Amino acid sequence: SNAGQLCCLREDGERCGRAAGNASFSKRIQKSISQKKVKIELDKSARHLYICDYHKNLIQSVRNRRKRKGS
Ligand SMILES: [Zn+2]
């Protein structure tokens, strides 16, 4: 019902394949993606806003993982 859907992101034209999780597609995530500059854009043919755990973790853990490397 609320967990039997699929991801609404396309990784290089690939409709993920992994089902949707508890996360939601927001602005912060969009901005996060833009910074990373990758081939991940929202699909407009969809009706819901729910991404998979895979993309959620992948996108969230790029601006929060370490705090020391060179500066
Ligand atoms: Zn996905």
UniProtKB/Swiss-Prot annotation:
| Tissues in which the UniProt entry reports expression | Expressed in all tissues tested with highest levels in pancreas, ovary, PBL, spleen and thymus; lowest levels in brain, placenta, lung and kidney.
The record places the cross-link (Glycyl lysine isopeptide (Lys-Gly) (interchain with G-Cter in SUMO2)) at 27
Q: Localized where?
A: Nucleus
Identify the domain of life: Eukaryota
Q: Where are the zinc fingers (Atypical)?
A: 7-55
Q: Outcome of altering residue 52 to A?
A: Abolishes zinc-binding
Question: What are the Phosphoserine sites (modified residues) in this protein?
Answer: 71
What protein family is recorded? Answer: Belongs to the SAP30 family.
Q: Oligomeric state and partners?
A: Component of the histone deacetylase complex that includes at least SIN3A, HDAC1 and HDAC2. Found in a complex composed of at least SINHCAF, SIN3A, HDAC1, SAP30, RBBP4, OGT and TET1. Interacts with HDAC1. Interacts with SIN3A, SIN3B, HDAC2, RBBP4 and NCOR1. Interacts with SAMSN1. Interacts with HCFC1. Interacts with SAP30BP.
Purpose: Involved in the functional recruitment of the Sin3-histone deacetylase complex (HDAC) to a specific subset of N-CoR corepressor complexes. Capable of transcription repression by N-CoR. Active in deacetylating core histone octamers (when in a complex) but inactive in deacetylating nucleosomal histones. (Microbial infection) Involved in transcriptional repression of HHV-1 genes TK and gC.
Name of the protein: Histone deacetylase complex subunit SAP30
- Species source reads Homo sapiens
User: Which residues of the complete protein appear here?
Assistant: 64 to 131 of 220
